[PDB]
Symmetry: D3
């Protein structure tokens, strides 16, 4: 039993961690796709795929989740939404269930014939990439939205410095 | 200390496994990039990236190598060899050493300023994707060139059936 | 004498039908290009090219227009507006006149040396993809804006269901 | 009942016509995809998609096949064979059966779950794009391999003149 | 000592000229990259790269700047900001200093390890592509923002006519 | 009167120089397009566009040809030969005559309506990129085929070292 979760992870926050631990209670393995693997240095997608890979690795590792229970696979976006499901399948191990709270993602897999489920959201007004990125820019409390290990990576790559400069 | 290895892994053979265990003796972690992640169903690149991810996962796992010691990251090829090193870096965690026996790969990283090393080859006349794929086509002994787990995956995805049909 | 008309046809509405019958009074054949053939599942371009091909086929057929009087050719968009006219010509039979109400389309063909004409609009405040898509979303009367055959296709492909989910 | 046939049609020869009439005896409509719609001016793909559209139109029309029994849809090739079936579906009306004599085409649809059938070949040593193009270049009898209407189009677009110059 | 300056030059205005003469006082040669070389016919990027090449050529020539002191190199944009610096380097002669007032440009070169400097702006509220294009559209005084030679090119290519039509 | 010449310039040899001086006797300015600006590090296209820009700059400058008499514009290749002429025009100043000895180039401009002329070749068995690259690889006398300034650039960028490694 393998599940599939896809997210920009810009950056990886507590919302992601919480939902990932939750899904891991009903699937043997979870394929975690890092979307928009080609985008970086924008207000929407500030970090590279490589950097986001380090965030998921540190965070999940620090939380005791065995590395063999998941797959971190970067997936570049594509112009055709009609070929996106195929794009994912082409780059990943087989999977039986899709977990997503994203309308487009849910609909594209739903139409292809996959069972998709939308997990309960955890503090959806605080745990979202949009809010995190906004706090980083306007000096709000963003550290409280991310696992300590992600905060460490963000400091090592000078993420706040970059995002603020670009703005 | 993180190393970087890149290969088409079409399919993942004993040559790859042998060299990977070897590199793991001098680096803490090895980033294993599955090249040509967009190609599949050709004589040169018969298996999808997703399928090759299952091969590396099974093989390395079956050989006792802890999953936390490596990264399996699919990387699509790009038209510009001059941007390829950057392409890799954009999709991966930082790395200090590049291990490659591929002339182009060695030269592109060498020019960018990375230390590249070419490990000793293991039965280079038998352990190569080219030979494996040729045996699969002409009914030679290809199973002896691959870890048992890879053979299992090849049978589950009907790899020989596909490669033979396409030919 | 062959004319050329290009539209997103998202979806094909009475405005399109009306103008098509009109153009068919001064040209022997009309090449109808379905633009943005690669886009689908967005608020702006909800239907695939394949689906829009079924809409034009049903609608024109139901209206008695002989199939030999036109060409339904899907054309993907391209990044370079300067090569777009060439892009069209590369995928279509020769044509002598361009019929368009779209500023960019008119200007790109005008600059290339083609005679372009902007036909009289039919209820431009009701017969537009934008209005149709808005009514489908906000439960307005969208069926009255489309030929009955297009409504049938929209129901068979669950168009309203998709567009509403994505929103 | 709709069938699907895909070919480079470089150029459209008697082999294509023969097989098309044959398929039309067991399907209500045939979707004829003109592959490699973006390639032109090479020894392998000398004619543009637009030109090949004129060839299929003239030939099928001249042979009395009602235009409403088929779809001529140009489809550009794509880098990923794994997304090609999806690419086709995205640009075409639904179809129940795939007719192909091309190994790759047969295998990609076969794996996606479509019933594919390979029709009897008609003079496979004479009716092939390769042979036609070779005769055009080496002054052989190529006109006998094509429907008279295709020969007319080839003369109107100066096809032999182009192919010979490029060589 | 070679410097590098990159701009959309839509169109080339007095602000560009002023800053270019200024940079030429501290560098032996200036590589002037015309960005977005693939975009044209939009409100943001109205002129083609070819047209903008004629503008820089006329303007710099008319101002007595020897042609051997600079390079006019069109550079298409790319989807990956992480590969953009590499993209530039791949298309240009070596350079030691980057001159830019653009946040993203400054940050991408800064991160790659290049010394970047932001020159003093000249009438930043008047000398900007945005203002020029706005005046051309709303009949303001745009000619006063551009070197006389650029105005001549704009008239020869019917730039105002195009921009107004598209709007 | 502006002419247009296009070449891979891999590398820029005496054949190019000779023909360029010749064309400059019948045109006021020559637009020199460096084709395949995106390719590099292959046996066919070993040098980047940036490097080839330095070769043309040094060579033409050393030969006393005023820099204002020509344009060095890198042009990336594109998948569609049917849009290539448009691609060139989009990136260049207007031109009245095309000078080429390349069959495809001649035919694509010829069909678009441009007057194309094939200049007399200078030692076509020695002055060709193919021969130069072969001598560099097999230790033949390649320096005699190139202007001294190009040889200097090739040594500064370690061209022979790169080409030999890749082989
Ligand atoms: N055509 C294409 O290329 C295409 C089509 C669709 C989607 N995509 C890609 O999908 C990615 C977008 O993912 P996204 O916007 O959902 O990213 P995201 O990181 O904001 O969210 C990822 C997912 O994580 C879960 N999640 C997030 N916060 C949560 C919280 N607080 N509590 C519980 N669950 C939570 C949800 O399931 C959500 O959809 C992008 O990379 C996008 O480009 C690509
Ligand atoms: N521009 C680009 O997109 C670009 C440029 C360069 C390379 N690439 C990619 O690089 C990949 C090619 O990798 P490849 O051809 O080397 O693949 P491969 O799987 O055949 O070999 C991978 C590497 O594994 C090692 N290896 C293999 N067999 C071995 C053996 N028996 N003993 C010891 N070591 C052994 C070598 O270091 C070798 O280079 C492709 O995906 C290619 O597209 C892409
Ligand atoms: N570079 C590029 O890729 C590029 C450049 C230009 C245009 N395009 C494509 O052009 C397409 C856009 O077409 P559009 O926005 O005009 O689509 P549309 O379907 O909204 O309208 C198509 C045309 O139909 C006619 N029409 C529509 N409603 C009418 C009515 N009520 N009465 C009379 N005539 C009516 C007009 O001539 C109009 O321009 C897209 O596919 C776009 O991507 C592509
Ligand atoms: N990834 C991709 O982009 C991808 C993958 C697969 C195929 N394609 C496309 O498929 C097209 C190739 O089609 P092709 O090589 O088969 O073209 P073709 O015109 O040579 O043949 C088309 C088909 O017509 C039939 N046919 C031809 N001659 C016949 C004869 N004498 N008697 C009976 N039947 C006959 C066969 O079914 C054959 O496969 C190209 O456009 C190719 O690019 C694209
Ligand atoms: N990924 C990518 O493809 C990518 C990433 C970054 C940037 N770009 C490209 O960079 C280009 C954008 O350049 P831009 O927006 O800065 O163009 P611009 O022409 O508006 O400005 C160019 C530069 O000229 C200088 N300048 C302009 N007006 C001046 C004035 N009045 N006084 C002094 N100096 C002045 C500044 O240094 C400025 O950044 C585009 O082509 C964009 O696509 C591409
Ligand atoms: N679709 C596309 O992207 C497309 C289509 C056509 C051509 N191209 C591009 O065209 C370029 C190829 O140019 P090429 O192969 O001719 O390069 P080249 O450098 O070998 O030759 C360039 C030209 O220089 C002249 N020349 C060369 N040697 C000469 C000599 N000894 N004496 C006299 N004249 C001489 C000839 O006119 C010749 O065609 C590539 O960049 C190719 O990709 C692109």
């Amino acid at each position: 039993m393998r599940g599939l979760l896809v997210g920009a992870m810009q950056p990886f926050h507590r919302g992601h961690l919480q939902v990932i631990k939750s899904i891991l209670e009903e699937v043997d393995e979870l394929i975690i796709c890092i979307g928009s693997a080609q985008l970086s240095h924008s207000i929407r997608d500030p970090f590279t795929a490589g950097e986001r890979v380090m965030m998921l690795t540190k965070a999940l590792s620090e939380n005791g989740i065995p590395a063999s229970r998941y797959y971190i696979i970067p997936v570049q976006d594509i112009e055709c939404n009609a070929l996106w499901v195929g794009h994912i399948k082409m780059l990943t191990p087989p999977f039986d269930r899709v977990y997503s709270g994203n309308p487009l993602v849910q609909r594209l897999f739903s139409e292809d014939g996959y069972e998709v489920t939308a997990p309960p959201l955890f503090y959806r007004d605080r745990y979202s990439g949009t809010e995190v990125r906004r706090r980083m820019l306007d000096d709000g409390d963003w550290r409280s939205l991310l696992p300590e290990s992600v905060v460490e990576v963000i400091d090592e790559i000078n993420g706040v410095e970059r995002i603020k400069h670009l703005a």
